[PDB]
Each structure stands twice: as structure tokens, then as C-alpha cells.
């Protein structure tokens, strides 16, 4: 390993004594992938007539030297093609230098396209150059993929494909939002008071002003300020930050899309979110009837819509109606399953919150088929409009697919006095030790007091959506550079 | 006094809650003011009475004209303004009486027939009229625009126009990049080692991992890892963070676009950046011959391309060639202009850096017409490829328009040994007190040691570009929520 690097470093030393070691004048004219497509059906004779001159640059992935003739496989950004090399065509000095290059080196050739006797498409090199020496060899392990994504990208074509699909899916989501009349906006990543979500923040400090500032846990409160300001339809796709546990399923920064539509409510949001996701599949995979991790996932069907208790009953039928309505039962049953209900997060827990907690331990992970869970207790929905007909319930949903939260939304709380009250109740929890409880945001209350129209809002987890569209088993597989441990 | 008004409005809200749902969310508008104004600009009183078009509108009540038998309100939705004509005959006495006590600012809604008033205005003959949300604070100095952008957005149509244009411009830039085959990517905003720029970082901490992290000053080093990985054309549009003073011309977070193209160099980058900017103007304004702050700005002309000393001579013709190549002259001349060259940023200053510093104090702010400044000293260009023909010079540019930096780019340093050396020289400066000097990044060097193809990279200041395109005088005028200033 070190001896290999040293040997390659010594070649680089010699290379510098005889010219420009890292030249930047070569201009490729074609892409391997495009040649493989456009000339799949052409044969030795067809190609000899066309006599197409090409110029390719990329990473040398294989090399075979056999006396007066040598073959290499070169990989550019698009794919692979062979270089065929003889001193007759490339000249003796280049041929000799070529033989001493290494797997990994960035190389470049001009030459005529042709087909080898074994059937492969290849370049009869008439010019051949080394553009950049690979000092470290390519490997020929489970975490290296993430610590050295650049290696994973060279060596695993599937990885390149996943990330091209991420990019296309996000463009497709933008198009969908734009067609539905939403204005894409940029709100701050630095907040003087974090909010818009239940999460532990990252804190930093502005030196000139001697001021604590928080990386955003969510843009929600800023996006609703825009609604007050009179933009009826806004959305934002960007990072949130959450300072919590690390795992294969957790990264400290992740991409959310939030959107807000004045004069809508949660029923509208659910229909709209459902349509968006289904179209996201059709765009990415040609169909909404797909598979994820070896199991059928039919996004073409209408999404299920269930209450919290409906969902517990569907997947944990042993629970009776009377049991799910009994405070004392719910507490002992939650204690049994490892939920400490004495924790400050539960300071304002009523019967609804206990049910929700039971749903999380029993049913949630089993929501394979797309399922909206509907009507959430007020005590855990501090930003959500209260029902007009049932006290203590909010017009809120969460969407689960494959057992993971993909979206969450609600009729927005536009009543400033209600909002102030619910903030004070969060501060109680926070004072009692609940680190995911919200801070009182006076500037936000002030904004609402200018008068905010009734509005519907939703956040979609772009990283999790992309997992489904690319059959990626963890969030780390859809992030170019996941954060890792030391 | 603003207080008595709030209190009075708060008391109306109290009465409102005793008689129904204060913040209803069931009203569904069917039309937009702007669309009605366009579609029926050409129609008259009789036309409209025949058509008899039933509409439903919701928005903010901006003016109210009251007479004995009737009332007119000017209501503003997301699209524009339309009049509501209100009589108790048609809306009912009880509603008419309530209406008289509603306030400028309230969010209101009507159904009714479209018609034209004798004074020529398009209006709704209301048959239903509702209050959707009480404005508790009344609608209405130079900094309030920024602390309360939501107020500025309601009251100033120019502000709305600027931000719609920002959004459109960014979509136009994404399209330009996509058409040129660049793949949009997302790299981390939390870096374990900050780099890619000369700036003071914001520092934070991940608690679960007990790990110091930095908010990114630039994504550059992560984008070049993707080039090692084999993506040929990548770009990213997102926030950087710099922990320094807030001014009218500075915000601690701002939007950059960086792009990288394998097998290109700085000449290519300059042509590409020039085309991008000119097309951005055509897209936004219909022409590249535009105006900024009352002065002609002709982006249609080819951009000037000057060396650092050429530019000093163009604006200060006193300076001779020998003066600008004399160390002792440059120092005394810099001392005269108030520049401290003893500062650690200048620890590795040679003649080039001194020239650059003189250019900053004499010519830079006068670069009104788009001007590329070209060929930068190595000691201030730690990430830029060195010239093949002139030692100590890098293939680097900065683009200035209206005296402000709009872009900066270079042929990328893909030589890992050169890069390691230049990093060690940065660490010297940093150890001697230069807080903008770079840290040594070993992981980045390791990536380059796998072999990176020659590449060209550039960063464009989106916020500053958008200023030019929208004729905004400061960066704060193109950010929805600028950071606090004192
Ligand atoms: N802010 C929410 C998404 C939007 C909820 C509706 N206002 C989140 O972080 O999940
Ligand atoms: N990282 C640079 C932009 C790209 C320079 C070329 N690699 C900046 O922050 O200005």
C-alpha cells in the first residue's frame, strides 16, 4: 500500500523532470456511453468505412500488455470504452511510456473507432497521453463507501446512477411545484430563535455582534411570514439541521421541501401530496407500481387514510376499544414497551398523546402501503389549526410509506393568541427538560398579528422520497457525503 | 397609540370569538384579481351584466370608501387588486353592520357578480362577505423593511416584483447550467474542516459525536471530490456562511453557485461565465444593454480582460511599469493609502500580492464595466493551477461589474504535492494570526492522490448577480430576511 504509493510517487518525480506532469490542454470530443449507444449495431466493416475519429479522456480501469500490442479500458463520466495501443500507431516512445502507466491514471487518446475480433468497441489510438498520475491505487469495506464516496463513484456504477436519479427527481419535483403555481424561495439558515419543528438545534455564534444563532431546524415560521406578506404559494427545498443521534438512518443535515398554499386545508394538502409523490414515481421509474427492497410498493392505488386509533387496531388487533380508551392501561402498556411517560416531553400528554405514543411503538413501522395518519392531539401539534368540531384535535397528518415518515402537514394555525398560548405551553416543557420543545418566538407572533390568511402547509422528506425512487436501503445511500464518526 | 389601536382591534377579535369561528378555513376562492383585470379589461357595463360572471375572491382589505347607501373596498390578493361593492340589500343588514367595523389590514372574502362601476373600475357586487382573519396590528423606517419584510411585502409592490424576479432569475440560471450538461448536486453544509475560501467560519458542535463542526465557507473541496469520482460537470447553488461584520453590503449567509467542468481551463471558464451573465440579463430584462442605479451598464459588449497591473494603470495612469514592479515603491505606496502590510495575511506576500493589494485600494471599485482581472499571484491563490510558462502566477480570474466581485474562477490545482505545499504555507499564515488562512485538509489531499483530471471551476455570487438584474442597491434588498444589524 505505502510501497505502491511510493513507487507511483517516484514515477511522478521522473514525469516532472521530462515535462508538464499535470497538463490541462486536452479536450475530449466524445463520450464513451454515447459511442456505445450510437454504434452498438455497427460491425468491423461498417466502422472501417465510417472511420470515425474520436477523442476520449478518463480513468484507466484495466490494462493488458502483450508485446507489440496492448489493450486498456478507460472510464469517463458516461461509461467505458477500450483503447487499443500499438507502437506503429502511437509511436515507440509513447508506447514505452504507456506500458509504465498505472490502473487509476487519468489518460487520454485520439484515434479511430473500431470493433475488435472479440466484439468490443474500441479506439485505435494514434495519440495517447497521461493527464494525471494516480498515486493511490484503486481497490479490487462497508463504511469506505461513505468516507470515500469518490472511490465508490469510480468503482461502483450503480452509485453514479443513484445520484443522477436524485438530481432528476428533484428537478421533477420543482417542475411539479412550478406547474401548480408555487414560487420557490430562499429563507435563512441562521435563526435567532430556532423553531418550526420538534428537534435539538445546532448553535453557533456571530462574533462581531456577540450573538448566539441557530442553524435552522425548519424554515416553517419564515415561510408563513411570506404568506402574511401576501405570497399565496411558496415552497423551499433545502437543508435542515438536527443535533441528535448518528445512525445509518440519521444524518445531521437532510433536505426537506416545505410548501404553503393560502386558502387551503389539510384535506387539500393530502390530495396534493399524494398526487405529487405518485407523479414523482411515474417520472423517475415510468410507473407508480414499483418495488422497494424486494417487496411490491403500489403507489398507483389510492393512499390509505386512517386515524391514529384506526391504525393501531389494524396492525395490533389484540388491543380492545376499552383498553385504548383507558389512561391507566395506556400508561402501563407504554411503560412495558419502554416508553417513559414521566419524561418532560409528556408533561402535557392527554389520552390522544398516549395513543400516538402507542401507535409509534406498535403500528408505525408496519405502514408499508402509503398511509396518511390523520387528526393529531393538540398537545403535540403546536403549529397546527384546531378542529372546529372536536376539541383537542388538530387538522394534521403524517404520511408513511415503507414504515417511514415521508411527509407531514396541516391546516396552519393563523390565530396569534392561540399560537402564543401554545408556545407558552412548549416553554413549560422546555423549562422541565424537553430539549425538543419549542422556544417562544415573539417576532413570529408579531407577524401573525398583522393578519394571516388561512393556509395549508406540508413538508416532504426529499431524501426519503429519493430512497424509494432509487431503491436505496438507507438515507446514507442518497447523500453524496454523509456525516460520519471518527 | 399604536397600542390603543392594537387593543381596540384585540377587543373586536374577542367579540368575534363569542359569535362564531374567528379564523375560518373553509372559504375557497375561485379567481384571482389580476386574471379578472386582464381577461375583462376590454369589457363594459352591459357586456358584464350579460356574462353575469360569478366570482369568489379573498385577500387583504387595503382601502375602504364609505357612503350613506353603499361601501367600496379595495381588496388585494396574491395577484393584484379588485374592488368589492357592498350594499346591505345584497349582503344583508347584519353583515353590512359588521363590515363597517372591520379594519384596513383584515383578510376578507366575497362572492358576487363581476361588474364595472361608473368610474370605470372592475368590481364584485358582493352577495356574500366574510371576515377570514382579523388584522390586530395596523398597516403603516429605513430598516423596518428588513425586520418586517412581511410588512414591506404587503405595502410595497416594488418589493414583490424584486423577489419574483429573483426566483425567475435563479430558475433561468439552473436552466442555463442544465442545458450545458451540468448536474446539480448537494454537498454538506457542515464541514469537519472548513475550506475552499479565505474567510472566518462559524463554529458549532455535534453533541452525540462530541465533534466540532464548521458551517461551510464554500463547497469547493467537496465538489472537486466529485470530479475525482468521475462526474465531469457538477454545480451547486446554496448558502455559504462567513463569520464577519454585518453592513449594507454584507450578510453572514449568502447564495453562491459553484460549478466544475473536467477538461476545461480558465479561458473556457471566462467565456462560459461571460455568456452565462449576458444571457441572465437578456432573460431577466429582455436585453444585455441595461441600467444600474441610474447609469448605463452594457453587458452586450465583450467583457474587458486585464492583468492586475493593466487595471491599476487604466484607472491611475500615473503609475509606471517600473514602479508597479518595485517592492519598496509598492510598500510605501500601500503605507500611504492606509494598508497594513505587516498583517499576517501578507506573511507570504511577494511583488504580485502587493500589486493585488494596490489594485484593491485604487482600481477595483472603479470597474464599472464588466472586467475580468487575470493571472493572480500564487501566494494568494492556494487552490489555483500554476501557469506552465510564468512561475508564481496562477490561471485565475475575478470578474467585477459595477465595482463588485460577481465571479471568480480558475484552472483547478489537481497536483496533490503542490496542494499539500500550499496548504502548509496557509497554516503558517494562520499560525501567525491570519484568521482567513486555510486549514490543512488531509482528506482532501487523499482524494487528489487518487488522480483528479484537469478541471476548471468557478463561483458566481448569485445575490450580487440578482442585484444587477433587479436594480437593487444593496445585497439586503435581494434577501427576503436579512440578518439583524445594529
Ligand atoms: N416544519 C415541518 C414541515 C411543515 C409542517 C406544516 N407547517 C417539519 O419540519 O416537518
Ligand atoms: N470557492 C470559491 C469559488 C470557486 C473557485 C474555483 N475553484 C469561492 O468561494 O469564491
> Closest-CA residue in chain B for A171?
B184
Cα-flanking dihedrals φ and ψ of residue B384, to 5°?
A: -100, 140
Q: Which of A105, A153, A451 sits opposite B451 (nearest CB)?
A: A105
Q: How distant is the Cα of A213 from the closest Cα of chain B, in angstroms?
A: 10
Residue A331 alpha carbon to ligand 2 centre in Å: 56
- Residues of chain B in contact with residue A151, where contact means CB-CB under 8 angstroms, are 229, 450
Query: Is B201 in contact with B227 (CB distance < 8 Å)?
Result: no
Domain boundaries, chain B: 2-140, 141-485
CA–CA distance, B438 with B217 (Å, rounded to integer) = 11
**For residue B105, is it left (φ>0), alpha (ψ between -120 and 50) or beta?**
left
CB neighbour burial string for A65-97, b if at least 16 within 10 angstroms, e if fewer: eeeeebbbbbbbbbbbbbbbbebebbeeebbeb
Q: Which of B170, B204, B228 sits opposite A203 (nearest CB)?
A: B204
Is some CB atom of chain B closer than 8 A to the CB atom of A118? no
CA–CA distance, B422 with A319 (Å, rounded to integer) = 67
CA–CA distance, B33 with B359 (Å, rounded to integer) = 53
Q: Which residues does a gap of C–N over 2.5 Å follow in chain B? A: 140
- Residue A464's contacts (CB-CB under 8 Å, 6 or more residues apart) are A404, A405, A406, A475
Residue A428 burial (C-beta neighbours within 10 Å; 0-12, 13-18, 19+)? middle
Query: Is B172 in contact with B460 (CB distance < 8 Å)?
Result: no
- Residues of chain B in contact with residue A231, where contact means CB-CB under 8 angstroms, are 78, 153, 160
Return the ligand 1 atom nearest residue A260 CA. 7
CB of B398 closer than 6 angstroms to any ligand 2 atom? no
CA–CA distance, B108 with B132 (Å, rounded to integer) = 5
Counting Cα atoms < 13 Å in the Cβ hemisphere of B161 gives 11
Ligand nearest to the CA of A265: 1
Query: Is B303 in contact with B329 (CB distance < 8 Å)?
Result: no
Domain B141-485 of CATH type 3.90.1210.10:
no
What is each CA distance from B302 to A479, B402, B466, B467, in whole angstroms? 40, 15, 20, 21
Question: Helix A220-228 crosses helix A442-449 at what angle (to 10 degrees)?
Answer: 20
CA–CA distance, A86 with A65 (Å, rounded to integer) = 10
Long-range contacts of A212-219 (CB under 8 A, 24+ apart): A213/B202, A214/A190, A215/A189, A215/A190, A215/A191, A215/A241, A215/B204, A215/B215, A216/A188, A216/A189, A216/A190, A216/A191, A216/A240, A216/A241, A217/A241, A217/A242, A218/A256, A218/A258, A218/A459, A219/A187, A219/A188, A219/A258
SS (H, E, C) chain B: CHHHHHHHHHHHHHHHHHCCCCCCCCCCCCCCHHHHHHHCCCCCHHHHHHHCCEEEEEEEEEEEEEECCEEEEEEECCCCEEEEEECHHHHCHHHHHHHHCCCCCCEEEEEEEEEECCCCCEEEEEEEEEEEECCCCCCCCCCHHHHCHHHHHHHCHHHHHHHHHHHHHHHHHHHHHHHCCCEECCCCCEECCCCCCCCCCCEEEECCCCEEEEECCCCHHHHHHHHHHCCCEEEEEEEEECCCCCECCECCEEEEEEEEEECCCHHHHHHHHHHHHHHHHHHHHCCCEEEECCEEEECCCCCEEEEHHHHHHHHCCCCCHHHHCCHHHHHHHHHHCCCCCCCHHHCCCCHHHHHHHHHHHHCHHHCCCCEEEEEEEHHHCCCECECCCCCCEEEEEEEEECCEEEEEEEEECCCHHHHHHHHHHHHHHHHCCCCCCCCCCHHHHHHHHCCCCCEEEEEEEHHHHHHHHHCCCCHHHHCCCCCCCC
A214 three-class SS: strand
Long-range contacts of A45-49 (CB under 8 A, 24+ apart): A47/A113, A47/A114, A47/A115, A48/A114
Nearest CA to A419 out of A395, A393, A385, A372 is that of A385
Query: Is A404 in contact with A297 (CB distance < 8 Å)?
Result: no
Ordered DSSP codes for A307-347 = EHHHHHHHH-TTS-HHHHT-HHHHHHHHHHTT--TTSGGGT
- A283: cell is 417520472
Query: Is B106 in contact with B133 (CB distance < 8 Å)?
Result: yes
> Which residues of B are part of a known binding site?
398, 405
Q: How distant is the Cα of A439 from the closest Cα of chain B, in angstroms?
A: 19
**In terms of CATH, what superfamily is A1-140?**
Nucleic acid-binding proteins (2.40.50.140)
A189 three-class SS: coil
Q: How distant is the Cα of B82 from the closest Cα of chain A, in angstroms?
A: 15
CA triple B415-B228-B448, angle to 5 deg:
30
Nearest CA to A61 out of A72, A46, A51 is that of A72
Nearest CA to A223 out of A5, A396, A455, A431 is that of A455
Sign of CA dihedral B363, B368, B374, B380: positive
- Residue B138's contacts (CB-CB under 8 Å, 6 or more residues apart) are B2, B5, B6, B9, B103, B104, B105
Domain B2-140 of CATH type 3.30.930.10:
no
Window 63-92 of A: residues touching B by CB (8 A cutoff) are 75-77
* Residue among A197, A226, A266, A273 to mutate when testing ligand 1 (max atoms within 8 A of CB): A197
| Integer-rounded Cα radius of gyration of chain A | 29
Is some CB atom of chain B closer than 8 A to the CB atom of A386? no
Amino acid at each position: 500500500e505505502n510501497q505502491i504509493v511510493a513507487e507511483r510517487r517516484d514515477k511522478l518525480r521522473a514525469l516532472r523532470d521530462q515535462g508538464i506532469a499535470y497538463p490541462n490542454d486536452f479536450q475530449p470530443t466524445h463520450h464513451a456511453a454515447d459511442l456505445q449507444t450510437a454504434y452498438a449495431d455497427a460491425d468491423k466493416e461498417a466502422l472501417e468505412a465510417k472511420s470515425l475519429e474520436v477523442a476520449i479522456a478518463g480513468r484507466m480501469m484495466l490494462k493488458r500488455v502483450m508485446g507489440k500490442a496492448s489493450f486498456a479500458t478507460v472510464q469517463d463520466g458516461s461509461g467505458q470504452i477500450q483503447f487499443f495501443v500499438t507502437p506503429a500507431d502511437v509511436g515507440a516512445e509513447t508506447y514505452d511510456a504507456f506500458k509504465k502507466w498505472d490502473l487509476g491514471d487519468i489518460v487520454a487518446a485520439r484515434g479511430v473507432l473500431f470493433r475488435t475480433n472479440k466484439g468490443e468497441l474500441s479506439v485505435k489510438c494514434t495519440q495517447l497521453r497521461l493527464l494525471a498520475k494516480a498515486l493511490r491505487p484503486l481497490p479490487d469495506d462497508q463504511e469506505t463507501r461513505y468516507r470515500q464516496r469518490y472511490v465508490d463513484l469510480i468503482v461502483t456504477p450503480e452509485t453514479r446512477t443513484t445520484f443522477r436519479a436524485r438530481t432528476k427527481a428533484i428537478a421533477s419535483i420543482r417542475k411539479f411545484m412550478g406547474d401548480a403555481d408555487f414560487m420557490e424561495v430562499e429563507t435563512p439558515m441562521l435563526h435567532p430563535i430556532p423553531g418550526g419543528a420538534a428537534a435539538k438545534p445546532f448553535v453557533t455564534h456571530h462574533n462581531a455582534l456577540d450573538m448566539e444563532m441557530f442553524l435552522r431546524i425548519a424554515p416553517e415560521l419564515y415561510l408563513k411570514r411570506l404568506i402574511v406578506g401576501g405570497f399565496e404559494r411558496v415552497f423551499e427545498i433545502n437543508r435542515n439541521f438536527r443535533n441528535e443521534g448518528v445512525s445509518p438512518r440519521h444524518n445531521p443535515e437532510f433536505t426537506m421541501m416545505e410548501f404553503y398554499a393560502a386558502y387551503t386545508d389539510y384535506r387539500w394538502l393530502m390530495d396534493f401530496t399524494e398526487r405529487l409523490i405518485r407523479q414523482a414515481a411515474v417520472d423517475a421509474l415510468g410507473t407508480a407500481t414499483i418495488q422497494y427492497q424486494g417487496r411490491e410498493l403500489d403507489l398507483a392505488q389510492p393512499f390509505h387514510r386512517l386515524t391514529i386509533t384506526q391504525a393501531i387496531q389494524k396492525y395490533a388487533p389484540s388491543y380492545t376499544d376499552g383498553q385504548l380508551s383507558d389512561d391507566a392501561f395506556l400508561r402501563s402498556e407504554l411503560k412495558r414497551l419502554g416508553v417513559d411517560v414521566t419524561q418532560p416531553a409528556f408533561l402535557n400528554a392527554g389520552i390522544g398523546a398516549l395513543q400516538l405514543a402507542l401507535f409509534e411503538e406498535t403500528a408505525e413501522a408496519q405502514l408499508w402501503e402509503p398511509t396518511f395518519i390523520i387528526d393529531y392531539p393538540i398537545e403535540v401539534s403546536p403549529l397546527a389549526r384546531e378542529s372546529d368540531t372536536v376539541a383537542g384535535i388538530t387538522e394534521r397528518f403524517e404520511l408513511f410509506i415503507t414504515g417511514r415518515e415521508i411527509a407531514n402537514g396541516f391546516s396552519e394555525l393563523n390565530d396569534p393568541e392561540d399560537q402564543a398560548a401554545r408556545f407558552k405551553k412548549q416553554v413549560e416543557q422546555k423549562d422541565a427538560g424537553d430539549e425538543e420543545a419549542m422556544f417562544f418566538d415573539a417576532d413570529y407572533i408579531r407577524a401573525l398579528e398583522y393578519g394571516m390568511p388561512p393556509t395549508g402547509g406540508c413538508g416532504i422528506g426529499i431524501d426519503r422520497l429519493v430512497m424509494l425512487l432509487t431503491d436505496s436501503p438507507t438515507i446514507r445511500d442518497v447523500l453524496l457525503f454523509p456525516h460520519l464518526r471518527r
